[PDB]
């Protein structure tokens, strides 16, 4: 029942450094944040499970559905934590219709409506991912469609977790965590200021100042 | 339990396409949408779900009498009454034979508690219809909802009448056992212009990671 | 649950019609009632009983404590369905504590208040019937007295089960069912208005032209 | 001020009315005055005469042309007569023709927001929302009226809202909670307003309080 | 416009104590009150009136129209600070129609629903009485109703005023002035209670203590 | 303060249809018609231009501003649309900002001095991103300020949407003529004046 | 529009406030003027000639007539001195009485909304209304306030309405938020609302 | 699930009069308080549940060394960690040891959710310290709480930095685990004038009776 | 009434992209963004205050009560529309009731409360600005912040307008703008956004025929 925390990173010191804090159960990962990196797809993945030992969202090349099925089938045999990266389109409904039938775990993304994460639940995803940040930006509030999703699947108990995804800042965090939120990806530069707070920091030389005298 | 959604249609090209996403749980039928009967059978056999159709009489006899004809095709099939006293009759009769039905053309919540309580298998308040009085037909299928929250009566709710994208969202957003939609409604579920922008960029992205070697 | 429909009628037809639909689960009756319809008061109230199966409220004559009971005593032998309608008096909280005591049901009638509501309740009334039309006449909201009788019974979980009665239209029984109220008693005419839409009629014209177009 | 009108046809009741000084005008129809054995216009005159305010009757007609003929003959019965226009197409276009030659005009027979709107920019004096005829479909009238009374608020349309199909005391205090212009209702509903039960208490304690004052 | 306070009273000293204090602006009163203070009653209400100084409401007798109104005329000439108490029935209102044109001030009192206070406003009443206490005794909530009243007249701003009465604690006087009722008339032993604090008594012997 | 209805459309039968009524008060077009339009119904009449940049586009709106007083000049929101509403707005010509999906893009019209936005309504309800939502907080932004631009409900489709609009106190919610249609009728008018006819009927019978 | 009074007597914080442009009066009482090293009337006079804004000050007899005398005696002093009378009935009768000589008057030792009407009602030019000691009796001190103030919106009473009893930034805060006419605070908690550790990394960082 | 009240003490005699009440659940402490190995265990016989007390070190393993030797004391010890990544990282580590946590100088909900998905026992939100900022404490212990609902993290919100009973009441009325306060503002939730008053008046009663 | 957004920002070609759409109505500056540019502090100011012709927020380099004012007026002499930026202290409020008395315009900035706000508002500051972006950060909620500083300004009137600043993104703009703040101050790269709705593209596509 605990909140979930994600790292949208393919860096292993910030996933060592995740674990390590013992607050980050996942990593989900991308053709941009693997494009930032530059190394092995399959590779990079397989590093990742074996570090963050928790579910590891990767997506796929293909757009068809029988592309999109054949390469998750790939990308699975990699490891137990390797999660299926489907965009949502009706292929990738199909896809995702196939593939919980075969036990392959999927996580349905850009998601910018309630409708569209209606869908991607009834189809037997295993994560949602709603692009928060993406909608704050056109200005039709991203937490609020968050929300929706939120109200939607709590109304139904559907076996879909959410995953707030492009996350920016600290409060879509708060905001996505008051609200309830299965999971929150996010960068693990936001992850860092998480931890931060000027008084935090005027507590501890309240003690600091004392001990040199 | 998870949200259905039904089909408005006797196009069996659309359900074999709903059944291929996972998301088509059942349909609702009439004779406009090509011998009865058999495209009953015929649609029946596709979704493997309810299916709802209509009877020709309005008299009690006669309509308990094509109800049992029409329940012998298959197990699937729901017979639609029309929201009527001799309806109501014959919803008592039918349900006391193990015989589904859907009470239809409902537009309060008096009649939706008539509907339950003589022992509707379904109920279908027609919303669009509703709208377009300008008496706001969300809110009498909400107070629908509401009612059969304050009771447990075992009749599930059909949003039907539904005409676009946001009469699902906000009938799932209430908690509608079912909604059954056009199938150009459905295809609009899938759609957004953020989805169709993410797809470009991570194609553009991904294509220039390959590029990279 | 399942939300209860109760008829104010003594006429056997309307009940049949009820029964028949399905939708009516007991029967609240009155002297004037059943003296309207050519019916001696116990044959009628025998009659209803085995037509309804189900709760048929009657009322007895006296208005002091022994002779309620003595009535109420007389009245229950008719048959398992009869519930005494006992106004709310102390007189007639005492016959409830009684009654309740010796396995006879009760309907508490004349109920206008909730503290009145808390009582009969207490006493352990098997039901209790705020008069709701009534109150909306004075203008002082009977719709408003019914939730916080709903509300007092809701957070207490009274055994007491709750008939809104002096219904007199469609939307006291919709405003009765969207606040939760066990049971809604209602006049014959109003249970026939709430079959009626005229988007209903409208659908089936409709529906019967789209027929008979298809037959082609 | 809230308005008060009387749904009616009989002189005696809209001279108790005006007696009281709480009646400001009249809604009438033609089934009223053949109750009370009248002829349409005359009893209309008389009742003009007897209020002196707004008094409501319809026309014939239902097509634009006729309507307006008509709408024109009553007008010169009376400075106070206002003509009831159904909610059509037709009868928009007549309040249109009428309003521009100072003919006052109801629309009536509105059962939504939307008509509503069409009504006030037509430029009609009145809207007559029915109440009750809705709460009867369980389609809640008084919400309907709120989202009129609403809508006017917003846009101050110089139509006043008449709350229509009044069948009880409620109706009136709702109405008025949310603050619509007129309330039309029939005499009946009217002599239900004065009562209490506390009132009447209030009134036999007082006449004791005069009695034991004089004794001493 | 300031809440005012009337008293229910017929007792001279605690309307001269209440004006002493420039707290009372008027006074509601009927013979019981008056009677108890062994005074005839036109006497009695003109002393009123004299100490007062502001508008005092006194009943009439009669239940007929044409009785109540003979008999507010009566009263009318006591003093201008007199206003005319009117039970809620058809009579009373048909009076304060007849009155209200004449410049004679009423009081529409026995007023338990929002139905009732339309019609007096209507009417022409100067003011209107709601009974909250009677009927908060029958747990039909008296504040509820009141607070109907003070919504309604103010959805229509009728020039009636509102007197809260059957008050008979400071929550009622707290609750109608929360509402903004215009007017709030009580017995003086609530007026007393007013004033009262168990922390102004402790400030006071701490500022005393030194 | 009255709430206004504007047509879409181009038919000048469904426009003298809603004057005959009285309850037409302008038109928004797409695609010389204009000025017929304009002297129909003698009140704004909306008109893109072709160009997509400032100069072409204030080129444009000087050219169709002659044609009619009653002429409203259709900028898209862009950039250019902004920096063209600038400048038509200095030299009194009037413009409708359209192609708005969020009130982001709504204050900078206001801003820029637009006569008119036009938020699309049943397009952003068709994303389920919720357009009645969106309109909702454009009018409460518009009031916080009191910007002179006017609100054009615009991609309405249903009666609701007008309802909606209406309740919230939009300017002016421009439809198309089937649904204003729509907003005539009600099955208990149709009832009523049955009856009303049974009851005219029975009244001559007694006498 | 909101006014700031400080609880003090001392004449350094005083002029700190008034160099800040923040402290509009000041309110008094005999235990701050003697933990000084001063006199009732002169630090009253010295306080009033820096506040330059009504100064609250305090009398010593509780009786009618004497509190009256002894108003009179204070007024003299300056026109900006305001008299406090505790919430009494006494003290309620010399309120009427000073408001028509048009001396200015600031009922004290207010804890519920019906004192409050009862001194606006009088004509009292202030209320105090003591928060902080109502908090501390757990039965909320800052909803007594919003109820005063709720009352005194509904009336239009002249009255003005001074939170007193302050303690800390959060009762400055939510008086404020509820629109109250004056919190009066001392000295001490005004300083802590200059005060933000964001603030004085800002400093660091852009002056830097 | 009752609500916890600790004290914000080191002395004996106001935790034996919390522990003689049966009000008082546990002590949080700190060395200043103490006038440190001994007088925590003095404590903890005493009050016979969870002690918190603060080490000295900032960096992980230090920390963790002394949570490890603080912890043998005994078994109501709870080590009060602040809130930092290296703390963080001894929750975990110390966690898994079972040896229980108390993550101090929590400032906002973010931090509230780290201390809890790191395993901490406790989590001790500063709400007096934020209400002094004008930033309202209470609403981010507030926030806090709804969040640890949502989620039914194991960690217990301990609301500290309690000045008055105000802070109290709002803290119970949001269903706050545990509130620990100074023993003075314990006094003050004892005490009421209407109470004494009461007591007065029971007395004269009693006098009266004796008639 | 109209709400006002000014650029953070010193660069001019942005400053003229803002003025020729006619929607930004001031700038806000600091020594970091004229550096940025490569220019000096004094010279900038003016060349900022020719071309936007509005509100143009300057700090100055001083803590000091007494060096604050000095520079101040000093400031103050480039334009007609300089502002002085004076961070949220005890000298700086005390300079902002000197400078108020003499009709010199100052913005109270490194405002994080509201009880901050309400001292800037009584000593007389032409504008306060409280730092939205920064606060959301440590999770204490910015725009809540900002939404209590609107409340306290609407219940008293202060002449005092508010500069919502640490603009970040889009949804900072709406929802002080759904609250009624009088002015947001925003980075140009926020501003370029705020045009923008794939929706609009879309349809000058479908119009682009």
Same mark, same amino acid.
């Given at each position: 029942?605990?909140?979930?925390?994600?790292?949208?990173?393919?860096?292993?010191? *910030?996933? %060592? %450094?995740?674990?390590?804090?013992?607050?980050?159960? $996942? +990593?989900?990962?991308?053709?941009?944040?693997?494009? =930032?990196?530059?190394?092995? /797809?399959? !590779?990079?993945?397989?590093?990742?499970?074996?570090?963050?030992?928790?579910?590891?969202?990767?997506?796929?090349?293909?757009?068809?559905?029988?592309?999109? +099925?054949?390469?998750?089938?790939?990308?699975? !045999?990699?490891?137990?934590?390797?999660?299926?990266?489907?965009?949502?389109?009706?292929? $990738?409904?199909?896809? +995702?219709?196939?593939?919980?039938?075969?036990?392959? =775990?999927?996580?349905?993304?850009?998601?910018?409506? &309630?409708? !569209?994460?209606?869908?991607? #639940?009834?189809? $037997? #995803?295993?994560?949602?991912?709603? /692009?928060?940040?993406?909608?704050?930006?056109?200005?039709?509030?991203?937490?609020?469609?968050?929300?929706?999703?939120?109200?939607?699947?709590?109304?139904?108990? /559907?076996?879909?977790?959410?995953?707030?995804?492009?996350?920016?800042?600290?409060?879509?965090?708060? *905001? #996505?965590?008051?609200?309830?939120? @299965?999971?929150?990806?996010?960068?693990?530069?936001?992850?860092?200021?998480?931890?931060?707070? &000027?008084?935090? @920091?005027?507590?501890? *030389?309240?003690?600091?100042?004392?001990? %040199?005298?």
């Amino acid at each position: 029942h605990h909140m979930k925390i994600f790292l949208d990173t393919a860096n292993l010191e *910030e996933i %060592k %450094k995740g674990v390590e804090w013992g607050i980050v159960d $996942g +990593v989900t990962t991308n053709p941009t944040l693997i494009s =930032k990196e530059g190394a092995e /797809f399959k !590779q990079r993945v397989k590093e990742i499970c074996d570090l963050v030992k928790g579910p590891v969202s990767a997506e796929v090349v293909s757009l068809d559905y029988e592309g999109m +099925v054949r390469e998750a089938r790939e990308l699975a !045999q990699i490891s137990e934590y390797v999660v299926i990266k489907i965009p949502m389109t009706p292929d $990738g409904i199909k896809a +995702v219709k196939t593939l919980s039938a075969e036990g392959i =775990k999927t996580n349905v993304t850009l998601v910018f409506s &309630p409708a !569209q994460a209606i869908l991607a #639940a009834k189809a $037997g #995803a295993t994560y949602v991912s709603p /692009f928060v940040g993406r909608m704050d930006d056109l200005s039709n509030d991203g937490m609020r469609m968050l929300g929706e999703i939120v109200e939607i699947y709590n109304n139904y108990g /559907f076996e879909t977790e959410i995953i707030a995804a492009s996350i920016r800042h600290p409060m879509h965090v708060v *905001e #996505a965590a008051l609200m309830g939120v @299965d999971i929150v990806t996010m960068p693990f530069a936001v992850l860092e200021k998480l931890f931060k707070h &000027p008084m935090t @920091d005027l507590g501890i *030389e309240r003690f600091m100042e004392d001990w %040199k005298k």
